[PDB]
Design a protein around this ligand. Structure first.
Ligand SMILES: CC(C)c1cc(-c2n[nH]c(=O)n2-c2ccc3c(ccn3C)c2)c(O)cc1O
Length: 209
């Protein structure tokens, strides 16, 4: 059972601009996703302070990076708070808590898209490098769900029949054919060192066999 949704107009416009831009500094997508993971880890850590049982679904707070040359995918996995079905639809489908309109105004005025995270929409920088993004998520209070979009104005959500996660979020970037450099461990390592060295949660790069 698959449900289809439309992006809010402003989000569709943002995705269109990102998807199509010749913006060369594409490596920033990774720090944005890592930053989101860190934020979600902050969220579960915070809740756990007053309700320890929230970590029954897993005590480890970490971020894993998983390149897959065979599938041409780069996966970012965290054990953060995850998202309920409602959270998932709202966070990805709407302006939600972000400064999306101010960002679009700033872009029109010639701002650098590296500022995207400052406007609370860093996730969409994934489309600099990905033709399709899948987001699998598990929150303590809901089932495991899979969100996906290849842009073009719509996304889908379905209950995930994949491998169960205890709790957290997995972002699967289905890379553009010209963007396979982000499957190279040496490339990933350097991007993490440049832009994510002061994230306090452990970030582990899984080197391909
Ligand atoms: C949005 C992307 C897909 C994403 C989300 C979560 C997630 N799991 N539980 C959460 O609350 N978040 C989260 C974190 C940050 C966010 C939002 C919304 C706006 N910002 C800035 C949501 C994640 O762990 C990794 C990710 O890449």
């Amino acid at each position: 059972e698959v449900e289809t949704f439309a992006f809010q107009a402003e989000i569709a416009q943002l995705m269109s601009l990102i998807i199509n831009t010749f913006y060369s500094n594409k490596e920033i997508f990774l720090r944005e996703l890592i930053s989101n993971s860190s934020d979600a880890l902050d969220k579960i850590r915070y809740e756990s302070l007053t309700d320890p049982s929230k970590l029954d679904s897993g005590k480890e707070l970490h971020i894993n990076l998983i390149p897959n040359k065979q599938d041409r995918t780069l996966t970012i996995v965290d054990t953060g708070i995850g998202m309920t079905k409602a959270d998932l639809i709202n966070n990805l489908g709407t302006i939600a808590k972000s400064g999306t309109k101010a960002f679009m105004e700033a872009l029109q005025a010639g701002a650098d898209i590296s500022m995207i995270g400052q406007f609370g929409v860093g996730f969409y920088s994934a489309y600099l490098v990905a033709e399709k993004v899948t987001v699998i998520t598990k929150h303590n209070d809901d089932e495991q769900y899979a969100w996906e979009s290849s842009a073009g104005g719509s996304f889908t959500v379905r209950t995930d029949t994949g491998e169960p996660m205890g709790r957290g979020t997995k972002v699967i970037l289905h890379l553009k054919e010209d963007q396979t450099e982000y499957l190279e461990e040496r490339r990933i390592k350097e991007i993490v060192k440049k832009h994510s060295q002061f994230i306090g949660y452990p970030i582990t790069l899984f080197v391909e066999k």
